[PDB]
Amino acid sequence: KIVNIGAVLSTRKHEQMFREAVNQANKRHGSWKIQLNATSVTHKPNAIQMALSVCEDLISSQVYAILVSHPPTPNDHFTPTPVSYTAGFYRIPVLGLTTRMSIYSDKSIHLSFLRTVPPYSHQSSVWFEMMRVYNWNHIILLVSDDHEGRAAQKRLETLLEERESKAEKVLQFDPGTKNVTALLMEARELEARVIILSASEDDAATVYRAAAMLNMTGSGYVWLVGEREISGNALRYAPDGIIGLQLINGKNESAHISDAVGVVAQAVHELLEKENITDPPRGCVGNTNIWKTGPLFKRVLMSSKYADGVTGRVEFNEDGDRKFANYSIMNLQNRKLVQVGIYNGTHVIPNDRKIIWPGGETEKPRGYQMSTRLKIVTIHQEPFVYVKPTMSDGTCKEEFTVNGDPVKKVICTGPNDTSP
Amino acid sequence: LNIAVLLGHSHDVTERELRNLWGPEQATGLPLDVNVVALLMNRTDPKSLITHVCDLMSGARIHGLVFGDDTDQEAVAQMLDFISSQTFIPILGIHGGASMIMADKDPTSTFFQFGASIQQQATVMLKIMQDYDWHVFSLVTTIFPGYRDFISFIKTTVDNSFVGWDMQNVITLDTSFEDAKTQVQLKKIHSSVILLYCSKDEAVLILSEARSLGLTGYDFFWIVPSLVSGNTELIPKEFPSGLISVSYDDWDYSLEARVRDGLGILTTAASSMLEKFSYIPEAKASCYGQAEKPETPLHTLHQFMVNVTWDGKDLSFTEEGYQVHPRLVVIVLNKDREWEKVGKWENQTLSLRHAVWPRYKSFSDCEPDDNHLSIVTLEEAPFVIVEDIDPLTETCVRNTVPCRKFVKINN
Amino acid sequence: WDMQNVITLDTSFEDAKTQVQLKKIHSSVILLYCSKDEAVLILSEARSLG
Amino acid sequence: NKKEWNGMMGELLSGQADMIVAPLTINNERAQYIEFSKPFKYQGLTILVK
Numbered sequence: 047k048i049v050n051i052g053a054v055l056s057t058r059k060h061e062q063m064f065r066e067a068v069n070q071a072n073k074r075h076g077s078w079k080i081q082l083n084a085t086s087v088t089h090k091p092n093a094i095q096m097a098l099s100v101c102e103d104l105i106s107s108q109v110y111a112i113l114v115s116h117p118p119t120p121n122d123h124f125t126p127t128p129v130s131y132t133a134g135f136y137r138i139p140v141l142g143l144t145t146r147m148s149i150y151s152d153k154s155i156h157l158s159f160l161r162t163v164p165p166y167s168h169q170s171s172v173w174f175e176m177m178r179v180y181n182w183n184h185i186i187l188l189v190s191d192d193h194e195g196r197a198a199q200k201r202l203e204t205l206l207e208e209r210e211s212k213a214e215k216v217l218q219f220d221p222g223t224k225n226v227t228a229l230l231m232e233a234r235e236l237e238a239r240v241i242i243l244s245a246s247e248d249d250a251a252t253v254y255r256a257a258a259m260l261n262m263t264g265s266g267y268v269w270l271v272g273e274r275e276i277s278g279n280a281l282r283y284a285p286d287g288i289i290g291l292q293l294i295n296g297k298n299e300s301a302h303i304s305d306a307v308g309v310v311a312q313a314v315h316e317l318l319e320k321e322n323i324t325d326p327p328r329g330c331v332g333n334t335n336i337w338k339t340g341p342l343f344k345r346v347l348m349s350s351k352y353a354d355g356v357t358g359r360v361e362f363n364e365d366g367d368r369k370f371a372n373y374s375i376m377n378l379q380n381r382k383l384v385q386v387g388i389y390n391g392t393h394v395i396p397n398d399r400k401i402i403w404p405g406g407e408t409e410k411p412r413g414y415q416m417s418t419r420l421k422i423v424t425i426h427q428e429p430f431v432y433v434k435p436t437m438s439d440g441t442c443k444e445e446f447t448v449n450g451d452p453v454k455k456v457i458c459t460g461p462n463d464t465s466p
Numbered sequence: 467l468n469i470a471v472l473l474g475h476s477h478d479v480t481e482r483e484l485r486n487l488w489g490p491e492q493a494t495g496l497p498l499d500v501n502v503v504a505l506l507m508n509r510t511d512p513k514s515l516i517t518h519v520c521d522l523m524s525g526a527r528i529h530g531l532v533f534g535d536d537t538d539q540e541a542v543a544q545m546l547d548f549i550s551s552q553t554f555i556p557i558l559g560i561h562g563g564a565s566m567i568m569a570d571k572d573p574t575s576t577f578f579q580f581g582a583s584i585q586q587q588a589t590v591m592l593k594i595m596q597d598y599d600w601h602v603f604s605l606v607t608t609i610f611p612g613y614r615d616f617i618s619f620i621k622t623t624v625d626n627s628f629v630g631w632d633m634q635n636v637i638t639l640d641t642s643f644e645d646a647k648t649q650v651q652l653k654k655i656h657s658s659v660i661l662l663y664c665s666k667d668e669a670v671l672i673l674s675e676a677r678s679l680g681l682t683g684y685d686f687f688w689i690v691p692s693l694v695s696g697n698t699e700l701i702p703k704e705f706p707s708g709l710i711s712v713s714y715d716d717w718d719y720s721l722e723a724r725v726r727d728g729l730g731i732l733t734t735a736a737s738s739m740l741e742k743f744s745y746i747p748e749a750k751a752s753c754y755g756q757a758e759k760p761e762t763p764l765h766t767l768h769q770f771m772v773n774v775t776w777d778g779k780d781l782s783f784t785e786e787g788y789q790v791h792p793r794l795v796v797i798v799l800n801k802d803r804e805w806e807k808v809g810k811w812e813n814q815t816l817s818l819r820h821a822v823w824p825r826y827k828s829f830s831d832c833e834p835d836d837n838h839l840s841i842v843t844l845e846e847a848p849f850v851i852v853e854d855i856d857p858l859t860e861t862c863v864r865n866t867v868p869c870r871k872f873v874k875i876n877n
Numbered sequence: 878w879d880m881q882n883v884i885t886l887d888t889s890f891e892d893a894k895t896q897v898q899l900k901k902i903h904s905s906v907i908l909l910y911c912s913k914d915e916a917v918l919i920l921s922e923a924r925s926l927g
Numbered sequence: 928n929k930k931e932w933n934g935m936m937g938e939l940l941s942g943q944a945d946m947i948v949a950p951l952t953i954n955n956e957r958a959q960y961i962e963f964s965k966p967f968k969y970q971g972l973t974i975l976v977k
């Protein structure tokens with residue numbers, strides 16, 4: 047008659063905050079014989095002994111819900127993935143806290159993993175809704191990383207499928223390259239100026255440093271990025287007037303801990319409704335089979351609906367992500383972050399603040415400059431397209447017709463013979 | 467180099483045969499040292515898995531892992547995908563859950579599986595539908611994962627085909643159904659051929675509703691992958707007798723040929739890299755006692771074994787981490803409520819033993835009879851002209867009808 | 878009269894074999910001969926069948 | 928095993944061109960992917976013989 051909860055968490059003070067959230071979770075459900083015990087673990091210098099300490103501690107603990115959060119590492123190591131793999135072997139449910147990569151979009155990779163923070167692909171939702179603000183229909187997508195940018199491209203095409211509008215050009219390329227000037231010059235020559243970017247820190251810094259010297263930050267250009275593109279050396283090289291998005295309480299983990307504790311509390315006290323309550327095995331030495339009500343309790347988590355907590359209404363989708371998070375539409379004004387709007391569950395609310403664009407006036411840029419250089423193509427047709435070589439030096443002769451009318455010629459280009 | 471073959475099996479494959487398997491093989495030794503260590507394990511829990519893998523990586527710097535499994539749980543390979551990200555060892559998955567196919571990996575992972583992706587399997591199923599001229603189809607999709615990619619691959623396959631498909635509305639399902647909205651979704655179906663991508667638990671309920679809704683006539687057909695149809699040991703009574711499935715589980719290609727091909731791929735990659743690069747053995751020291759930023763190697767076999775051929779076998783691997791020309795077997799659920807090999811798949815050609823397609827009519831014991839009329843004819847120059855199959859579509863053109871000619875070899 | 882062959886029923890229907898007979902109806906105009914006790918089930922089925 | 932379009936539609940759908948000004952024989956297949964204008968010339972088919 048106890049419920050064990052494993053907290054894979056960073057600091058001892060936030061461990062005490064987690065234990066206080068466990069203590070506060072015992073209030074509204076009475077003095078029933080069920081109890082809530084908490085076991086916390088910390089960092090390890092790699093991903094191997096993370097998996098080691100996590101697997102022995104969570105097998106010896108026999109937990110139900112697992113809360114994992116390790117942002118603060120100075121290296122690029124980020125993955126809480128072996129904890130999710132170890133639990134998803136036994137289908138033990140994990141509440142991820144502060145991981146945001148879209149590789150958790152596949153439940154085949156993560157069988158018993160749910161999180162109450164949305165991944166970056168849901169930012170594309172705002173990237174549709176902002177188009178609804180400005181009636182834009184020709185966008186330029188720019189994606190460096192292929193680890194998750196295929197999912198963002200999928201989400202953007204899904205959002206454009208309902209209106210049946212087309213993205214004019216998408217770009218997938220090398221993570222961590224220096225020759226993105228070719229990418230930007232190939233992206234220059236369209237009628238669209240709305241540019242959408244989602245990358246890492248150094249890739250964003252590279253394309254900012256390229257596009258600043260390539261005159262693609264002035265009038266007409268629209269720069270719409272995500273949260274990872276306004277920090278670090280990308281923020282150091284950031285062009286002004288850029289529109290970005292920010293998660294409200296994205297780095298605030300402490301209230302998110304208590305919100306997840308309330309989610310676990312209502313999930314457990316809904317789990318006691320149905321019968322055949324199963325127990326976590328001793329999977330260290332002796333037990334290899336999975337836990338029985340894994341998909342059952344996961345479907346219980348699919349029926350989650352909340353009206354309490356600091357975040358308030360938290361709800362899981364069909365992919366186990368976060369529904370309806372408020373965002374902060376931020377703007378960069380003279381290398382200072384300026385709040386210029388908020389994002390509802392499904393709506394965009396501009397505030398009374400001033401929106402400053404990277405170009406000239408602060409009006410909204412109708413940045414569809416129609417191409418006056420309409421590139422005409424044809425073929426050598428004998429009655430219609432007479433093709434002659436150069437007359438004197440790359441020129442033509444103003445000949446006359448038989449009826450007193452000069453033959454109108456034009457300087458075209460083309461090959462001479464066949465390709466083999 | 468040092469190569470470990472750990473095979474957790476319930477079927478008794480003895481370890482001494484696995485050790486002496488290298489004997490009659492190519493013992494010419496293009497590397498100076500080609501050593502194998504065979505192991506068994508009767509408990510495949512992930513603690514012991516990581517323990518034995520770290521023991522083998524500490525076991526004289528083993529540069530290649532060969533793992534199979536007898537149990538039917540794919541999540542073992544879900545652990546193994548992590549292990550390539552740390553041990554930096556080329557790992558091949560042989561049998562069981564190691565042979566069960568996961569979707570997407572990491573670029574810093576040298577882990578590979580003997581099997582076939584779901585898109586290659588859908589290509590094989592649509593090749594079946596091409597070869598039997600079944601064009602009017604539907605698509606029943608539950609919330610079992612990979613389903614949106616499955617729908618997208620079918621749509622991009624239809625858009626890139628000269629077949630002339632007739633896709634009906636893609637049937638979507640919310641959850642474990644109350645038979646209220648999914649009732650209407652199944653009653654949207656009135657076509658013949660139905661594709662089904664669901665789970666093994668929900669397949670019995672969906673096909674039981676389809677038998678209740680009369681969607682299991684012998685005019686109709688049902689084609690599923692092996693991700694929903696499990697092993698041969700569990701065949702429920704609710705499945706329609708005639709269910710076409712596509713699986714990688716060959717029985718002629720048993721565990722001995724599997725580990726022989728795995729050792730052949732590993733030694734071929736190591737030998738061909740030895741003729742390109744000099745100092746081939748590069749291994750991690752141990753799983754214990756290290757900080758962050760692990761000592762990454764420079765020349766690995768991940769960027770090298772794109773081409774490999776073992777005595778004619780196209781065992782090459784894709785850039786995404788799957789087989790280029792895998793081995794697939796098309797089976798049906800015959801009248802004896804079992805699974806019989808209908809056709810194996812070559813590099814491109816769908817070899818079909820039964821080009822005659824029988825009815826497999828015994829779905830219930832109460833069905834109407836004698837609707838397919840077996841009709842014979844004869845070639846005459848102004849009446850019946852019979853030509854070969856078209857090379858562009860591998861399909862008879864729209865005014866022509868399919869037939870078969872019984873062509874013998876000799877006397 | 879371009880008349881399809883007569884779709885008949887047997888009992889308070891199982892929604893197994895009469896449903897296939899209703900799926901034979903790719904026509905527009907339907908003459909229905911039944912009582913009030915069965916027409917609710919018939920029209921609920923045809924509403925379910927589209 | 929992917930469909931492709933060569934020729935002037937190849938240079939148009941890649942973005943290298945903007946407008947095909949040519950004796951474009953209008954057919955259903957090219958109408959399924961791009962849009963046309965009303966034809967400047969009405970013209971059938973014939974056989975050149977000696």
Ligand SMILES: *[C@@H]1O[C@H](CO)[C@@H](O)[C@H](O)[C@H]1NC(C)=O
Pocket residue numbers: 048083084085
């Ligand atoms: C509760 O968890 C703590 C974790 O340190 C453990 O020491 C203790 O034995 C547990 N108590 C029960 C009753 O499970």
Ligand SMILES: *[C@@H]1O[C@H](CO)[C@@H](O)[C@H](O)[C@H]1NC(C)=O
Pocket residue numbers: 224225226227228
């Ligand atoms: C790489 O960038 C440089 C500087 O912009 C440019 O001169 C060069 O042409 C680019 N490389 C290619 C292959 O275009």
Ligand SMILES: *[C@@H]1O[C@H](CO)[C@@H](O)[C@H](O)[C@H]1NC(C)=O
Pocket residue numbers: 259260261
């Ligand atoms: C960018 O702008 C500067 C001054 O506005 C000009 O000298 C330079 O040629 C421009 N470069 C390009 C590629 O347009």
Ligand SMILES: *[C@@H]1O[C@H](CO)[C@@H](O)[C@H](O)[C@H]1NC(C)=O
Pocket residue numbers: 295298299300301356
């Ligand atoms: C997180 O939550 C509150 C309210 O969102 C925020 O103002 C504060 O910075 C954080 N509070 C704590 C206790 O961490």
Ligand SMILES: *[C@@H]1O[C@H](CO)[C@@H](O)[C@H](O)[C@H]1NC(C)=O
Pocket residue numbers: 320321322
């Ligand atoms: C619980 O298990 C019993 C078998 O002991 C079964 O009869 C019953 O239906 C189950 N109840 C559920 C799954 O709600």
Ligand SMILES: *[C@@H]1O[C@H](CO)[C@@H](O)[C@H](O)[C@H]1NC(C)=O
Pocket residue numbers: 357358359360370371372390391
């Ligand atoms: C988002 O903000 C609005 C108003 O600012 C509030 O009504 C709503 O409850 C918030 N939703 C969440 C999930 O925080």
Ligand SMILES: *[C@@H]1O[C@H](CO)[C@@H](O)[C@H](O)[C@H]1NC(C)=O
Pocket residue numbers: 390391392393
């Ligand atoms: C913000 O969201 C809430 C809840 O979804 C709802 O009041 C409405 O959709 C939005 N409010 C507005 C647009 O004033």
Ligand SMILES: *[C@@H]1O[C@H](CO)[C@@H](O)[C@H](O)[C@H]1NC(C)=O
Pocket residue numbers: 435436462463
């Ligand atoms: C094109 O080819 C012809 C004959 O093949 C040759 O005489 C001529 O110099 C070529 N170059 C031109 C027209 O620039």
Ligand SMILES: *[C@@H]1O[C@H](CO)[C@@H](O)[C@H](O)[C@H]1NC(C)=O
Pocket residue numbers: 506507508509
């Ligand atoms: C095989 O199973 C037995 C259990 O009967 C176990 O004791 C033994 O350790 C297993 N063998 C290996 C190599 O693990």
Ligand SMILES: *[C@@H]1O[C@H](CO)[C@@H](O)[C@H](O)[C@H]1NC(C)=O
Pocket residue numbers: 738773774
């Ligand atoms: C096959 O592999 C060899 C190395 O083993 C490589 O040199 C060759 O390019 C590959 N492809 C072909 C078509 O031979």
Ligand SMILES: *[C@@H]1O[C@H](CO)[C@@H](O)[C@H](O)[C@H]1NC(C)=O
Pocket residue numbers: 813814815
């Ligand atoms: C691949 O398939 C073709 C059938 O078109 C066959 O002719 C060829 O021999 C096959 N390749 C090999 C290596 O057998």
Ligand SMILES: *[C@@H]1O[C@H](CO)[C@@H](O)[C@H](O)[C@H]1NC(C)=O
Pocket residue numbers: 875876877
């Ligand atoms: C027997 O097979 C050979 C194959 O080379 C063929 O040429 C010959 O015509 C066959 N004989 C008969 C009688 O069909």
Ligand SMILES: *[C@@H]1O[C@H](CO)[C@@H](O)[C@H](O)[C@H]1NC(C)=O
Pocket residue numbers: 874876877
């Ligand atoms: C042998 O085959 C040929 C044609 O293949 C034909 O005469 C007949 O089918 C056979 N003849 C005998 C005598 O078996």
